[PDB]
Enzyme design. Structure first.
Site, PDB file in Angstrom:
ATOM      1  N   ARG B  54      34.999  51.197  36.390  1.00 51.32           N
ATOM      2  CA  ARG B  54      35.520  50.208  37.499  1.00 51.32           C
ATOM      3  C   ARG B  54      36.208  49.645  36.290  1.00 51.32           C
ATOM      4  O   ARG B  54      36.632  49.370  35.707  1.00 51.32           O
ATOM      5  CB  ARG B  54      34.320  49.529  37.614  1.00 51.32           C
ATOM      6  CG  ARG B  54      35.301  48.328  38.367  1.00 51.32           C
ATOM      7  CD  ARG B  54      33.684  47.039  38.516  1.00 51.32           C
ATOM      8  NE  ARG B  54      32.615  48.093  39.556  1.00 51.32           N
ATOM      9  CZ  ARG B  54      31.348  47.667  39.867  1.00 51.32           C
ATOM     10  NH1 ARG B  54      31.155  46.303  39.411  1.00 51.32           N
ATOM     11  NH2 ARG B  54      30.738  48.293  40.717  1.00 51.32           N
ATOM     12  N   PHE B  59      42.123  42.053  35.089  1.00 52.30           N
ATOM     13  CA  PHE B  59      41.327  42.033  34.973  1.00 52.30           C
ATOM     14  C   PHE B  59      40.305  42.379  33.997  1.00 52.30           C
ATOM     15  O   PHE B  59      40.244  41.919  32.779  1.00 52.30           O
ATOM     16  CB  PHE B  59      40.538  42.133  36.124  1.00 52.30           C
ATOM     17  CG  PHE B  59      39.038  41.268  36.376  1.00 52.30           C
ATOM     18  CD1 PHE B  59      38.795  40.385  35.349  1.00 52.30           C
ATOM     19  CD2 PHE B  59      37.993  41.549  37.534  1.00 52.30           C
ATOM     20  CE1 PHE B  59      37.010  39.926  35.271  1.00 52.30           C
ATOM     21  CE2 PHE B  59      36.809  40.875  37.574  1.00 52.30           C
ATOM     22  CZ  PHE B  59      36.977  40.180  36.040  1.00 52.30           C
ATOM     23  N   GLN B  62      35.095  47.935  32.615  1.00 52.65           N
ATOM     24  CA  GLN B  62      34.317  48.601  32.841  1.00 52.65           C
ATOM     25  C   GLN B  62      33.136  49.851  32.356  1.00 52.65           C
ATOM     26  O   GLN B  62      33.599  50.405  32.777  1.00 52.65           O
ATOM     27  CB  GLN B  62      33.220  47.707  33.575  1.00 52.65           C
ATOM     28  CG  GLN B  62      31.956  47.689  34.044  1.00 52.65           C
ATOM     29  CD  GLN B  62      31.159  47.078  35.110  1.00 52.65           C
ATOM     30  OE1 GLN B  62      32.413  46.112  35.427  1.00 52.65           O
ATOM     31  NE2 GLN B  62      30.122  47.166  35.479  1.00 52.65           N
ATOM     32  N   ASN B 101      26.087  42.814  33.434  1.00 48.57           N
ATOM     33  CA  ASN B 101      25.084  42.568  33.803  1.00 48.57           C
ATOM     34  C   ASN B 101      24.740  42.110  35.478  1.00 48.57           C
ATOM     35  O   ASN B 101      25.984  41.901  36.090  1.00 48.57           O
ATOM     36  CB  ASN B 101      24.332  40.890  33.544  1.00 48.57           C
ATOM     37  CG  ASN B 101      25.393  39.554  34.079  1.00 48.57           C
ATOM     38  OD1 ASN B 101      25.822  39.167  34.771  1.00 48.57           O
ATOM     39  ND2 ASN B 101      25.348  38.804  32.467  1.00 48.57           N
ATOM     40  N   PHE B 112      31.734  45.152  29.534  1.00 50.12           N
ATOM     41  CA  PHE B 112      33.528  45.795  30.280  1.00 50.12           C
ATOM     42  C   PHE B 112      34.307  44.836  28.447  1.00 50.12           C
ATOM     43  O   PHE B 112      33.857  43.745  28.192  1.00 50.12           O
ATOM     44  CB  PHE B 112      33.655  44.521  31.422  1.00 50.12           C
ATOM     45  CG  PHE B 112      33.494  43.103  31.047  1.00 50.12           C
ATOM     46  CD1 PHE B 112      32.203  42.487  31.008  1.00 50.12           C
ATOM     47  CD2 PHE B 112      34.016  42.214  31.368  1.00 50.12           C
ATOM     48  CE1 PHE B 112      31.803  41.312  31.371  1.00 50.12           C
ATOM     49  CE2 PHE B 112      33.905  41.282  30.920  1.00 50.12           C
ATOM     50  CZ  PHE B 112      32.501  40.819  31.513  1.00 50.12           C
ATOM     51  N   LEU B 121      33.559  33.165  33.733  1.00 50.61           N
ATOM     52  CA  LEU B 121      32.390  34.932  33.039  1.00 50.61           C
ATOM     53  C   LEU B 121      31.772  33.620  32.206  1.00 50.61           C
ATOM     54  O   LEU B 121      31.271  34.644  32.020  1.00 50.61           O
ATOM     55  CB  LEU B 121      32.765  35.805  32.502  1.00 50.61           C
ATOM     56  CG  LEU B 121      33.498  37.183  33.678  1.00 50.61           C
ATOM     57  CD1 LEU B 121      34.071  38.584  32.927  1.00 50.61           C
ATOM     58  CD2 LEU B 121      33.263  36.942  35.000  1.00 50.61           C
ATOM     59  N   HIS B 125      28.137  36.030  31.232  1.00 52.98           N
ATOM     60  CA  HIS B 125      27.957  37.487  30.694  1.00 52.98           C
ATOM     61  C   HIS B 125      28.289  36.930  29.004  1.00 52.98           C
ATOM     62  O   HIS B 125      28.743  35.981  28.367  1.00 52.98           O
ATOM     63  CB  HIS B 125      29.370  37.972  30.826  1.00 52.98           C
ATOM     64  CG  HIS B 125      29.378  37.944  32.204  1.00 52.98           C
ATOM     65  ND1 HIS B 125      29.004  39.410  32.810  1.00 52.98           N
ATOM     66  CD2 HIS B 125      29.540  37.366  33.946  1.00 52.98           C
ATOM     67  CE1 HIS B 125      28.906  39.566  33.637  1.00 52.98           C
ATOM     68  NE2 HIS B 125      29.603  37.807  34.023  1.00 52.98           N
TER      69      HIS B 125
HETATM   70  S1  LIG Z   1      26.011  43.466  44.749  1.00 51.79           S
HETATM   71  C1  LIG Z   1      25.683  44.520  43.199  1.00 51.79           C
HETATM   72  C2  LIG Z   1      25.262  43.748  42.185  1.00 51.79           C
HETATM   73  C3  LIG Z   1      25.252  44.851  41.220  1.00 51.79           C
HETATM   74  C4  LIG Z   1      25.103  44.721  39.885  1.00 51.79           C
HETATM   75  O1  LIG Z   1      25.017  43.339  39.589  1.00 51.79           O
HETATM   76  N1  LIG Z   1      25.250  45.688  39.237  1.00 51.79           N
HETATM   77  C5  LIG Z   1      26.002  45.330  37.894  1.00 51.79           C
HETATM   78  C6  LIG Z   1      27.316  45.167  37.599  1.00 51.79           C
HETATM   79  O2  LIG Z   1      28.162  46.034  37.518  1.00 51.79           O
HETATM   80  N2  LIG Z   1      27.619  43.424  37.109  1.00 51.79           N
HETATM   81  C7  LIG Z   1      28.647  43.440  37.253  1.00 51.79           C
HETATM   82  C8  LIG Z   1      29.297  41.986  38.530  1.00 51.79           C
HETATM   83  C9  LIG Z   1      29.322  42.642  39.319  1.00 51.79           C
HETATM   84  C10 LIG Z   1      30.629  41.950  40.338  1.00 51.79           C
HETATM   85  C11 LIG Z   1      31.480  41.927  41.688  1.00 51.79           C
HETATM   86  C12 LIG Z   1      30.173  42.776  42.408  1.00 51.79           C
HETATM   87  C13 LIG Z   1      29.175  43.703  41.528  1.00 51.79           C
HETATM   88  O3  LIG Z   1      28.911  44.579  42.475  1.00 51.79           O
HETATM   89  C14 LIG Z   1      28.906  43.482  40.350  1.00 51.79           C
HETATM   90  C15 LIG Z   1      29.418  42.944  36.030  1.00 51.79           C
HETATM   91  O4  LIG Z   1      28.734  42.648  34.774  1.00 51.79           O
HETATM   92  N3  LIG Z   1      31.080  43.310  35.846  1.00 51.79           N
HETATM   93  C16 LIG Z   1      31.873  42.685  34.587  1.00 51.79           C
HETATM   94  C17 LIG Z   1      32.630  41.365  35.184  1.00 51.79           C
HETATM   95  C18 LIG Z   1      33.586  42.076  36.470  1.00 51.79           C
HETATM   96  C19 LIG Z   1      32.973  42.359  37.289  1.00 51.79           C
HETATM   97  C20 LIG Z   1      33.706  43.044  38.471  1.00 51.79           C
HETATM   98  O5  LIG Z   1      33.830  44.069  38.714  1.00 51.79           O
HETATM   99  O6  LIG Z   1      34.232  41.688  39.443  1.00 51.79           O
HETATM  100  C21 LIG Z   1      35.344  42.253  40.127  1.00 51.79           C
HETATM  101  N4  LIG Z   1      31.413  43.428  37.075  1.00 51.79           N
HETATM  102  C22 LIG Z   1      24.731  46.346  36.847  1.00 51.79           C
HETATM  103  C23 LIG Z   1      25.938  46.068  34.887  1.00 51.79           C
HETATM  104  C24 LIG Z   1      23.796  46.612  37.125  1.00 51.79           C
END
Ligand SMILES: *SCCCC(=O)N[C@H](C(=O)N[C@@H](Cc1cccc(O)c1)C(=O)N1CCC[C@@H](C(=O)OC)N1)C(C)C
Ligand SMILES: Nc1nc2c(ncn2[C@@H]2O[C@H](COP(=O)(O)OP(=O)(O)NP(=O)(O)O)[C@@H](O)[C@H]2O)c(=O)[nH]1
Ligand SMILES: [Mg+2]
Lengths: 170, 164
Positions: B54, B59, B62, B101, B112, B121, B125
């Site tokens: 991702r 931004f 990840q 998380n 990330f 965040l 985080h």
């Molecule tokens: S609704 C499903 C949630 C699944 C989940 O939390 N998976 C995590 C993960 O990737 N967490 C992301 C936070 C996030 C944000 C928006 C949608 C989902 O699905 C998850 C995370 O920690 N992260 C880092 C900071 C930026 C954020 C992001 O992409 O915002 C747009 N992602 C995994 C670790 C099991």
């Protein structure tokens, strides 16, 4: 030229927002879980004899920093509020989404449909009566769906379009 | 000294460059140690070969899913998950290294790298490091991202380890 509607699918993680949308758009179901950040789809449909273009925004079940969530609530014309019948927390989360939409739209009369998804599964934790009563308290329709069997899928989206059209008459 | 680890980044297998990180073991020792050990592979598993699944330009980038290889997986050196160690450090700008998380106390292996200040965040985080060298490589990685984070080429940790 035909009417065009901006629909937004909201709800907690894993309730089936994407599976409902992909069933509407592509007529197939995937067991795989690919969490959504944001995806957009378009489909031409005929609803009540009226041909229309649906712009569908499939949202993330996890909130980020609201300012971009307020964004798609600002521009969305109708909302599917999706929970899963085997996820009580997802049903409890429903009121938060409605509250946020009403706040952004400054209205108690926003086109919305309550969707109880995963109606094929035997792990139910949310009674249909609970959801019906919730939808009544909001003045909106309730549709039971299964993205897996396609039960209620067209009905949920088409009913939302009907709600938008009825709102535009007032 | 705080540990320094490196990632050699590849784009569809071709080398892009090396990114090195200082890990704030003096402030976040358990979280720093997890990332350090996963970077060396010394427990028999870790980041080598895994991808940045991702990438959202402006931004963050990840990565860190070496078990499911699709962004859903995660494994720490302490088990599937570990608690948020502390929220001392903040997402102050580009280069910050922080744990991904699924909510409170769900740290695994995903992480990330910020490419901007991401203050929303803070307190959610755990920040545990910063890019020390190769920020231009992180900036090059953003070309392969998109608004929803889907990547247009396979961006991988071709090699990784500890420098000191
Ligand atoms: S609704 C499903 C949630 C699944 C989940 O939390 N998976 C995590 C993960 O990737 N967490 C992301 C936070 C996030 C944000 C928006 C949608 C989902 O699905 C998850 C995370 O920690 N992260 C880092 C900071 C930026 C954020 C992001 O992409 O915002 C747009 N992602 C995994 C670790 C099991
Ligand atoms: N049995 C059954 N499974 C379903 C149904 N709808 C979705 N699922 C399953 O539930 C999981 C999550 O589906 P998904 O559509 O990705 O949910 P989401 O609400 O879009 N999740 P996110 O918020 O992360 O984007 C997947 O494994 C999917 O196959 C349904 O009606 N029945
Ligand atoms: Mg989804």
């Amino acid at each position: 030229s035909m009417t065009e509607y901006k629909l937004v699918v909201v709800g907690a993680c894993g309730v089936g927002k994407s599976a409902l949308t992909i069933q509407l758009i592509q007529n197939h179901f995937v067991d795989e879980y690919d969490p959504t950040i944001e995806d957009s789809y378009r489909k031409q449909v005929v609803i009540d004899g009226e041909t229309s273009l649906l712009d569908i925004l499939d949202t993330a079940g996890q909130e980020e920093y609201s300012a971009m969530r307020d964004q798609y609530m600002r521009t969305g014309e109708g909302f599917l509020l999706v929970f899963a019948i085997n996820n009580t927390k997802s049903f409890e989360d429903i009121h938060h989404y409605r509250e946020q939409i009403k706040r952004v739209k400054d209205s108690e009369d926003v086109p919305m449909v309550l969707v109880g998804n995963k109606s094929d599964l035997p792990s139910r934790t949310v009674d249909t009566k609970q959801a019906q009563d919730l939808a009544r308290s909001y003045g909106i329709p309730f549709i039971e769906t299964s993205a897996k069997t396609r039960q209620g899928v067209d009905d949920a989206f088409y009913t939302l379009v009907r709600e938008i059209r009825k709102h535009k008459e007032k | 000294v705080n540990p320094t680890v490196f990632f050699d980044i590849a784009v569809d297998g071709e080398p892009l460059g090396r990114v090195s990180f200082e890990l704030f073991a003096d402030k976040v020792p358990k979280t720093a140690e997890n990332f350090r050990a996963l970077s060396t592979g010394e427990k028999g598993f870790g980041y080598k070969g895994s991808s940045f699944h991702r990438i959202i330009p402006g931004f963050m980038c990840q990565g860190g899913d070496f078990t499911r290889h699709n962004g859903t997986g995660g494994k720490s050196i302490y088990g599937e998950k570990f608690e948020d160690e502390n929220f001392i450090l903040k997402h102050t700008g580009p280069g910050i290294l922080s744990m991904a998380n699924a909510g409170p106390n769900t740290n695994g292996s995903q992480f990330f790298i910020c490419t901007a200040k991401t203050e929303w965040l803070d307190g959610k985080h755990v920040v545990f490091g910063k890019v020390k060298e190769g920020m231009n490589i992180v900036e090059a990685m953003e070309r392969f991202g998109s608004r929803n984070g889907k990547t247009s080429k396979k961006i991988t940790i071709a090699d990784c380890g500890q420098l000191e």
